[PDB]
Amino acid sequence: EEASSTRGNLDVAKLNGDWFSIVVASNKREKIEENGSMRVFMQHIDVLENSLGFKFRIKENGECRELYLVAYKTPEDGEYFVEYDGGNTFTILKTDYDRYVMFHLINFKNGETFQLMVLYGRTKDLSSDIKEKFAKLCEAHGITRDNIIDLTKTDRCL
Amino acid sequence: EEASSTRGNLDVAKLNGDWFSIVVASNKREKIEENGSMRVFMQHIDVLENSLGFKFRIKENGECRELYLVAYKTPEDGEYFVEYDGGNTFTILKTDYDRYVMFHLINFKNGETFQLMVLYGRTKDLSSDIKEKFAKLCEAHGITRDNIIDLTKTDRCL
Amino acid sequence: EEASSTRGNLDVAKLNGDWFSIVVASNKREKIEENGSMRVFMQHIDVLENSLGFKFRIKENGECRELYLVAYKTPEDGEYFVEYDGGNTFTILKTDYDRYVMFHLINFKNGETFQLMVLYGRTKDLSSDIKEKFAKLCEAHGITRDNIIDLTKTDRCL
Amino acid sequence: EEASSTRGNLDVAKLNGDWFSIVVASNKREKIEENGSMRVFMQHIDVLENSLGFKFRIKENGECRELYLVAYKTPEDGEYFVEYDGGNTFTILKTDYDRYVMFHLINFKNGETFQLMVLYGRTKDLSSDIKEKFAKLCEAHGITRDNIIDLTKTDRCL
Numbered sequence: 132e133e134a135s136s137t138r139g140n141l142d143v144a145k146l147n148g149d150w151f152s153i154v155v156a157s158n159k160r161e162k163i164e165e166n167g168s169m170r171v172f173m174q175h176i177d178v179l180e181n182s183l184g185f186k187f188r189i190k191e192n193g194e195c196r197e198l199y200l201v202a203y204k205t206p207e208d209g210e211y212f213v214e215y216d217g218g219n220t221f222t223i224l225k226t227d228y229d230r231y232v233m234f235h236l237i238n239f240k241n242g243e244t245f246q247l248m249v250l251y252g253r254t255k256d257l258s259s260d261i262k263e264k265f266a267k268l269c270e271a272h273g274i275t276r277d278n279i280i281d282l283t284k285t286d287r288c289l
Numbered sequence: 290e291e292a293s294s295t296r297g298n299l300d301v302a303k304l305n306g307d308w309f310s311i312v313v314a315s316n317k318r319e320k321i322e323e324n325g326s327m328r329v330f331m332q333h334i335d336v337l338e339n340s341l342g343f344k345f346r347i348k349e350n351g352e353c354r355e356l357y358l359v360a361y362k363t364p365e366d367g368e369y370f371v372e373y374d375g376g377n378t379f380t381i382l383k384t385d386y387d388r389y390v391m392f393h394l395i396n397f398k399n400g401e402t403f404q405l406m407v408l409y410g411r412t413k414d415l416s417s418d419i420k421e422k423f424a425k426l427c428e429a430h431g432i433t434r435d436n437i438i439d440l441t442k443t444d445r446c447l
Numbered sequence: 448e449e450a451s452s453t454r455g456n457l458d459v460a461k462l463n464g465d466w467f468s469i470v471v472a473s474n475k476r477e478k479i480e481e482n483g484s485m486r487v488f489m490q491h492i493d494v495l496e497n498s499l500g501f502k503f504r505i506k507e508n509g510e511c512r513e514l515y516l517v518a519y520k521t522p523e524d525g526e527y528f529v530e531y532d533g534g535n536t537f538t539i540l541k542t543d544y545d546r547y548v549m550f551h552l553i554n555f556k557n558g559e560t561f562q563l564m565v566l567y568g569r570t571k572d573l574s575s576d577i578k579e580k581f582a583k584l585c586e587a588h589g590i591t592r593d594n595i596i597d598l599t600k601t602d603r604c605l
Numbered sequence: 606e607e608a609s610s611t612r613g614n615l616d617v618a619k620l621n622g623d624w625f626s627i628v629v630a631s632n633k634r635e636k637i638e639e640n641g642s643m644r645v646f647m648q649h650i651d652v653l654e655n656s657l658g659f660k661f662r663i664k665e666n667g668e669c670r671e672l673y674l675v676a677y678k679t680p681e682d683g684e685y686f687v688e689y690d691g692g693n694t695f696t697i698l699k700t701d702y703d704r705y706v707m708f709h710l711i712n713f714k715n716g717e718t719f720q721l722m723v724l725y726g727r728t729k730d731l732s733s734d735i736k737e738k739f740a741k742l743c744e745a746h747g748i749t750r751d752n753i754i755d756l757t758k759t760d761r762c763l
Contacts, residue, residue: 177502179513181376181398184502186493199493199500201515203376205363206395206402212370218339218361239364240339335660337671342660344651355653359673497692497714521692522713528686534655534677553680556655560680 136209136223145228147178150251152187152287153231154262156269156279159245163280166190168216169238170280172287173251183211188288195288216240224268229253231261233268246272256283294367294381303386305336308409310345310445311389312420314427314437317403321438324348326374327396328438330445331409341369346446353446374398382426387411389419391426404430414441452525452539461544463494466567468503468603469547470578472585472595475561479596482506484532485554486596488603489567499527504604511604532556540584545569547577549584562588572599610683610697619702621652624725626661626761627705628736630743630753633719637754640664642690643712644754646761647725657685662762669762690714698742703727705735707742720746730757 134141152173155163162169170189177184179201186199202213202221209222217240226232236247250257250265262281269279292299310331313321320327328347335342337359344357360371360379367380375398384390394405408415408423420439427437450457468489471479478485486505493500495517502515518529518537525538533556542548552563566573566581578597585595608615626647629637636643644663651658653675660673676687676695683696691714700706710721724731724739736755743753 177515179502179515184515186495186500197493197495199495199515199517203370203372204397205370205376206378206397207365212361212363212376214361218363218370220364237364239362244364335673337660337673342658342673344653344658357651357653357658357673357675519686519688519692520713521686522694522711522718523681528677528679528692530677534679534686536680555678555680 132227134223134226134228136211139208141209141223141226142228143183143223144178146176146183146223146226146232148253149175150232150253151255152249152282153252153257154250154265154279154281154283155247156249156265156274157245157247158274158278159247160278162245162247163278166192169247170282172282172289173249176251185213190286190288224248225264231257231265233265235272246274248272248274255289290385292381292384292386294369297366299367299381299384300386301341301381302336304334304341304381304384304390306411307333308390308411309413310407310440311410311415312408312423312437312439312441313405314407314423314432315403315405316432316436317405318436320403320405321436324350327405328440330440330447331407334409343371348444348446382406383422389415389423391423393430404432406430406432413447448543450539450542450544452527455524457525457539457542458544459499459539460494462492462499462539462542462548464569465491466548466569467571468565468598469568469573470566470581470595470597470599471563472565472581472590473561473563474590474594475563476594478561478563479594482508485563486598488598488605489565492567501529506602506604540564541580547573547581549581551588562590564588564590571605606701608697608700608702610685613682615683615697615700616702617657617697618652620650620657620697620700620706622727623649624706624727625729626723626756627726627731628724628739628753628755628757629721630723630739630748631719631721632748632752633721634752636719636721637752640666643721644756646756646763647723650725659687664760664762698722699738705731705739707739709746720748722746722748729763 150173157163172188175186182201182203184201188195200213202211205212211221213219217238219238221234221236224233224235232251234249238245248269308331315321330346333344340359340361342359346353358371360369363370369379371377375396377396379392379394382391382393390409392407396403406427466489473479488504491502498517498519500517504511516529518527521528527537529535533554535554537550537552540549540551548567550565554561564585624647631637646662649660656675656677658675662669676685679686685695687693691712693712695708695710698707698709706725708723712719722743
């Protein structure tokens with residue numbers, strides 16, 4: 132069930148399909164809050180050649196804009212790169228394939244960096260248990276419980 | 290004089306300007322040989338926001354094609370990413386700024402990887418001494434002396 | 448039912464979804480034949496901000512590669528631009544939304560140009576009637592019946 | 606001396622080199638004013654394969670950001686496409702090669718369009734005569750003399 136890009140046992144092919152944004156967490160809270168560039172509402176993940184496509188929505192000034200970004204696989208185990216509001220490096224932290232997927236991302240922009248962690252579910256919402264396990268990993272990565280945001284209660288541009 | 294992105298003391302701003310391809314080395318020799326995607330003839334390096342632009346030439350079927358690629362700075366010390374014949378991660382190994390610059394690159398494409406090392410000079414050719422130091426670093430990175438190619442003797446699409 | 452980007456009455460939002468390559472036609476036959484860059488097997492069309500995303504497959508050396516290109520809307524009525532094997536300008540010739548969509552494309556590369564016309568269906572195959580109407584438009588655009596290829600009979604990388 | 610992409614007699618190869626922003630004009634004045642996306646300070650133009658590279662500076666929040674965009678040649682005589690703050694279509698209106706170059710651009714974004722005209726000089730400033738000829742063309746394209754801005758008097762991020 133559980134796999135991981137970092138662990139090196141993942142089967143990225145199975146990540147293909149629709150996903151929804153459930154919980155986002157970042158210590159640089161400004162980014163995941165209203166009008167934050169990282170507060171993205173995922174929709175679908177495409178598995179392409181040496182890369183992943185992400186179709187998602189974002190509320191830019193009270194208007195849900197539809198976007199699509201391609202992330203490329205890099206030579207370092209499990210790392211993907213995507214240019215978005217800086218240079219981003221992310222990995223697939225944990226996944227069971229048909230329920231959830233936890234991504235861990237680091238952002239670089241003008242000398243600064245920040246961590247970002249997201250939980251995606253194949254359903255509009257997920258098990259309270261899944262959300263706890265995720266809440267823990269955030270803490271295990273320096274992100275405080277005050278910076279973990281549950282997007283299921285808000286408008287995910289649906 | 291000497292700096293390094295990996296060493297973390299480099300001043301990438303000084304890399305701006307014209308550069309020429311002097312010596313390329315890769316154990317995956319097919320890549321640096323005639324018609325190889327990595328046998329590139331550098332021309333100029335632009336220092337942009339959170340990235341580097343590379344204007345270079347390449348002989349695709351007896352025809353020197355003019356290209357330009359942008360490489361983005363990633364969150365990991367000195368690493369840049371550029372999509373070209375796969376996912377590439379490179380670093381600035383050694384530079385004295387006004388003479389040479391040695392880059393070290395790893396390529397990933399369809400499960401496979403390979404190292405690539407290049408020496409650029411601000412002049413059409415460089416000191417026999419500079420070429421030796423480079424020949425050594427190649428060896429220090431597993432690339433044999435049989436896979437080190439001196440492009441100064443060939444047509445660099447000039 | 449029928450709309451058109453050129454006619455200026457189209458509702459591109461309804462083009463969202465899965466599409467299949469049914470018939471391709473070009474007088475520069477080499478392009479639509481085996482190993483031709485334009486012989487693409489469409490899969491899905493995404494409607495994004497000021498653009499369209501295209502996820503399709505292509506057989507590059509007996510190997511079906513998965514790709515995704517973004518085409519941008521230009522200031523000239525119904526014209527979209529996409530960089531692929533040159534500079535491409537295309538328009539939505541005719542569509543009924545839930546069955547077919549006929550695109551007309553012009554390609555520019557190294558001083559040369561060529562027309563390309565494609566018929567996409569929401570189903571793996573389409574009505575013999577739809578294929579006739581398309582066969583006619585091709586002729587109305589200088590493409591001879593000898594250069595109209597029905598991809599439904601071949602392997603569309605399925 | 607004078608050539609033109611639209612006139613179809615231009616030799617784009619000679620446009621290679623350093624250029625400076627002299628005068629910008631747009632009836633959608635907000636764009637060419639302080640903090641306007643179109644108020645760009647050109648630096649260099651690279652002539653690539655089937656395209657043009659533009660390295661320029663822009664003051665985003667009192668901070669001169671260094672950028673580089675690639676514009677692709679389209680199948681319609683003299684037209685180039687570049688994605689920047691929408692879909693842009695531009696042409697080389699008039700050039701004498703070693704002094705000035707006048708570009709004419711149309712922008713499309715979210716249903717709206719607007720014209721933009723720029724005069725670039727190989728020198729930090731140009732002849733009062735060159736600026737007049739340009740002022741006239743702007744008028745010949747519906748742009749009023751009140752929307753023609755001379756950037757030579759301001760900080761061009763130099």
